[PDB]
Amino acid sequence: APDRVVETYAEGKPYDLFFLDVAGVRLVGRKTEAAYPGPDRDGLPAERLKCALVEARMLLGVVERDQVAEDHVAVFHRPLGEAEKAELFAAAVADPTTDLYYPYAQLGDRVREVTDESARELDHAEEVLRDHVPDRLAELGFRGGVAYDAACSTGAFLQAVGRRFPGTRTIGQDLSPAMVARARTRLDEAHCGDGIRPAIPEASADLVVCRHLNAFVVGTGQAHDLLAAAASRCREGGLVVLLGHTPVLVSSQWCEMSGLTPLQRSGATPSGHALFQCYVLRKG
């Protein structure tokens, strides 16, 4: 018999309901505090953090049907055992094409600050991801060139990419001038301005990074406009990378309709204990 998971709009968090499309089977989970950056060691337990990471223990069951109503979102599912959760979660870790998405990230009222500690906070929450992406870009054929970060933040991420591919020109852009001030110490080039006004000519970058198309940063319409803005900077055959601390607001299906063929959709921690969103797309 099926079960129902609910997130109300007034005080619930619809953006915490994630879907995992594994092996033609859709699973539903509720994101909680994840073990960050790695799993609990033998004698030292890992710290918890609300971040991009999902783990098997946050899975709920096998999605049968949803019902989006006036004041809440409901997902009907058949519950999964703890061992069944881990095995299906492992199959998603073994397949980076697995989509991890949050279909209700723009529902509810909850979705409706640059300091020295605030820059350190987001840099820490993106660590498990700075460790993953540059190596994974090498395995996907990235050879270097011009790397464009449309919302570079401190610039630590794009700098990590430029370290992995020596000779890559790192060009950052951020809306916050406090962000740009820091990013100029880590990047060859950092511009102050909204991503909707890109600072580089079109089709001039071999890698475009988008970390701002996400819940609590932009709305749905804006995220799709900024996606078309950042991707217009990518040359043909180049790579577009979408990820984020908070749920990405664009689907990989929309990217495919935009001519951005997904090469991978999610990534896992080296231990395999967690999954996160990591869309790597090839512009056609």
Nearer to ligand A4D, 25 or 228 (CB): 228
Residues forming contacts to its own copies in the complex (CB under 8 A) are 1-4, 19, 21, 64-70, 73-74, 76, 99, 101, 103-104, 106-107, 219-221, 251-254, 256-257
Task: Give least dist CB 209 to ligand A4D, A.
Answer: 11
> Which whole-number Å values give the CA distances from 116 to 12, 124, 155, 183, 218, in the listed order?
31, 12, 14, 13, 23
Applying CB under 6 A, does 174 fall inside the site for ligand A4D?
yes
Q: 179 touches which of its own copies, ligand A4D, none (CB within 5 to 8 A by kind)?
A: ligand A4D
Kind of pairing, strands 25-30 and 17-22? antiparallel
Q: Which amino acid is at 108?
A: G
Enter the tokens of residue 60: 């709920």
Sheet order of strands, 234-243 included? 189-192, 169-174, 146-149, 205-210, 234-243, 275-283, 260-268
What x/- string results for residues 123 through 152 when contact with ligand A4D is judged by CB under 6 A?
Answer: ---------------------------xx-
Task: Give yes or no for a contact between 240 and 265, defined as CB atoms under 8 angstroms apart.
Answer: no
- Among its own copies, ligand A4D, none, what does residue 219 contact (CB within 5–8 Å per kind)? its own copies
Contact of 58 with 29, CB cutoff 8 Å: yes
How many residues touch ligand A4D under the rule CB under 6 A: the total is: 14
- Which residues make up the interface to ligand A4D (CB under 6 A)? 150-151, 153, 174-176, 179, 194-195, 211-212, 217-218, 226
